[PDB]
Amino acid sequence: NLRVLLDTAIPPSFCDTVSSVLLDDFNMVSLIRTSPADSLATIKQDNAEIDIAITIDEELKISRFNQCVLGYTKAFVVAHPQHPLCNASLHSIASLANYRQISLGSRSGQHSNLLRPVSDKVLFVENFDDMLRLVEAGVGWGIAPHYFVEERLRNGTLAVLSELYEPGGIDTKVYCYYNTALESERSFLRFLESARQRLRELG
């Protein structure tokens, strides 16, 4: 039995590809969704018995696991279109360490450099919908995965503040943390290769 974790920031399609590919060599698979803020924390608990994690988060050397990279995805910093920072931005790119960021809480309460909020004040939430309802309201601005936002974006419900920095969307790697037991295992080596190919292909 193979327990694999997938954070809320991994696009579903990625999930399917991961999921479907796993199926090829694998017979029992449990899939857990976590906040990206809680993934590494989770794998770290020895008991939780995770075997694979698919995350946007980074920690280079983890106690029992090896990192490697599955693919790339995109985040956008979004705000309600009427937000002051919205529209004219270049200062805005600087000024948002000052505006309220709706950031992703962590049960640990600690964040990597990657996920720690840029701004104070911050108001923590537990997931992206939570984060987005707030930003649509919209009390603050947030960084969200592409998928959680595409639909909204086209409507004009939401605005992209994130363009000048990293135009075209913030490029974010998708790591794969896997228990070292798996390193020799051909099933896993096969899995990785397929998924990777499929993901590039989809790109």
Ligand X SMILES: CCCCCCCCCc1nc2cc(Cl)ccc2c(=O)n1N
Q: Are 39 and 53 in contact (CB under 8 A)?
A: yes
Q: Is 171 in the site for a second copy (CB under 8 A)?
A: yes
Q: Residue 186: name its binding partner from a second copy, ligand X, none (Cβ under 5 to 8 Å by kind).
A: none
Minimum CB separation of residue 166 from ligand X in Å reads: 7
| Contacting residues for 39 by C-beta, under 8 A, at least 6 apart | 5, 7, 53, 55, 57
Q: Which residue is nearest to ligand X (CB)?
A: 75
Among 27, 167, 201, 203, binds a second copy (CB under 8 A): 167
Among 26, 72, 99, 124, binds a second copy (CB under 8 A): 72
Q: Is 181 in the site for a second copy (CB under 8 A)?
A: no
DSSP state of 67: -
Among 66, 87, 98, 187, binds a second copy (CB under 8 A): 66
Half-sphere exposure of 187 (CA within 13 A, CB side): 15
Sign of CA dihedral 45, 124, 114, 149: positive
Residue 39: exposure state from Cβ atoms within 10 A (0-12, 13-18, ≥19): buried
Nearest alpha carbon to residue 146 among 136, 134, 132: 132
Instruction: State the Cα–Cα distance between residues 160 and 149, nearest whole angstrom.
Output: 10
Minimum CB separation of residue 106 from ligand X in Å reads: 11
Span 93-122, contacts to a second copy by CB under 8 A: 93-94, 97, 113, 118
Span 184-203, contacts to a second copy by CB under 8 A: 184, 189, 192, 196
Minimum CB separation of residue 91 from a second copy in Å reads: 6
Instruction: State the Cα–Cα distance between residues 199 and 138, nearest whole angstrom.
Output: 34
Neighbours of 111 (CB within 10 A): 18
Window contacting a second copy (CB under 8 A); options: 25-33, 42-50, 66-74, 149-157: 66-74
Number of residues that bind a second copy (CB under 8 A): 26
Which positions lie near a second copy, rule CB under 8 A? 60-61, 66-69, 72, 90-91, 93-94, 97, 113, 118, 164-167, 171, 173, 180, 183-184, 189, 192, 196
